[PDB]
């Protein structure tokens, strides 16, 4: 609710770049729980000859690591000084938000099975409820790629 | 995947942190209406800050300064901006034990590698009181009164923060650009002398005690205080550090510490004795009040009938004629370090040693408020 809303008199870019940085790190400790051990879909990375098929989950390793590469970059993410950001990140952050949505979703469809035996469910519930609320608030993700989440979302 | 409910127990304090930080944002609405003032666009811009990310190698190293068992200290310029910093290297396993005051070195923030912790400090250009005593054995009297005092006030502050140093030494005391004195802190660096040791051509006592200064150190830590309540048992309190003063005081004036033993275990020994084993030399110069102090510093830390009960009353000694105790921090210093630059290591024994029986061999800001 109040949390993800841009605070009074903060540049959104910081407010965004911090918030996206928080989120990556949380999903990964969550998949850190699910580490190893492993309708339809949509697959990507084209053209390049890429974007084909058959991830059958357990891909996720080279998927997250591009955010790892994209969000650790000096020029894309200006930690340094007061040097500003290209703001074209608004496009890029949408990717890193949506590319993040994949593992969110994949963790929901197939692997949500193991989570509940640990009684840690509410954590991922909230954290997932956390992710959408933010990016939906800022419209960081379109309503058409939320289709798998659409039956789960509206429960309110 | 056994302990992965750790991502539960953490991520609460992740949500916990996330909440107060934001109720903190509401430190705004500070709202001075005591201004009938502007209007006039806006006086509020909030950057805001960041927890960013960080690393080593964001610091160029200039020269090495000193060394310790846990690790070396260092003079580093931040690659990023350029600046000069006192850099401390420490160690994670293996090593055990699993602000605001003019007197003590400034630890700003910290960061860490795989095996080493890193501390970043204001850099003190003037060496320490170790390398001074060496430079010219302080011809003192009045020199000493200054560098005490300034030591007392240092110490008396620390105690008043509810702290006992239990490390007070020539090398553990540092000289600033005005040649004044700040002590830093134990870091916290540790280890202990216990329990007890068992084995069972000179021509000057001065020259004989000059068999001191042995293999740099890089092993240490010797009894340049060690009041004798530490060995033995659980004990001390504020009076710990006053013994270290008399220990220290005695040395700049005499030419070695009281118990200087020629083996690290003949202290305890002598020190565990004093009484018998305290002796001022035959090289004459000491005041009647200057000696009187040491002996009352160097006595038993004894409470019961007495007090000490101290930390002032030391100021009540005749050894200190004046000064105000006020004007002290602005006063011409006995030695004002003369430097070639902001990088002058001139005052440190740059040396060479390089031994660390450690390596195999081969970041965060989650803080709260903002400086400066
Ligand atoms: N903040 C500082 N600025 C400049 N020099 C420093 C600073 N801190 C430490 N040094 C130097 O490094 C030496 C010792 O470092 P230190 O942190 O005291 O090592 P240690 O093993 O932790 N404690 P010690 O037993 O005194 O060596 C000092 O005597 C100084 O010469």
Numbering used by the authors:
A (entry chain B): 111 to 148, 161 to 278
B (entry chain A): 294 to 391, 407 to 508, 553 to 714, 740 to 749
Excerpt from the publication:
In the RAM network, the hippo-like kinase Kic1 activates the NDR-related kinase Cbk1, which forms a complex with the coactivator protein Mob2. Here we describe the crystal structure of the yeast Cbk1–Mob2 complex, providing what is to our knowledge the first structural template for an NDR/LATS kinase–Mob coactivator complex. In all three structures, the Cbk1 HM peptide is wedged into a binding slot in the deep cleft formed by the kinase’s αMob helix, N-linker region, and N-terminal catalytic domain lobe.
We collected crystallographic data on one Cbk1(HM-T)–Mob2 complex that diffracted to 3.3 Å, with one Cbk1–Mob2 complex in the asymmetric unit. Our structures show that there is likely an autoinhibitory HM binding site in the N-linker region, which would further hinder HM phosphorylation.
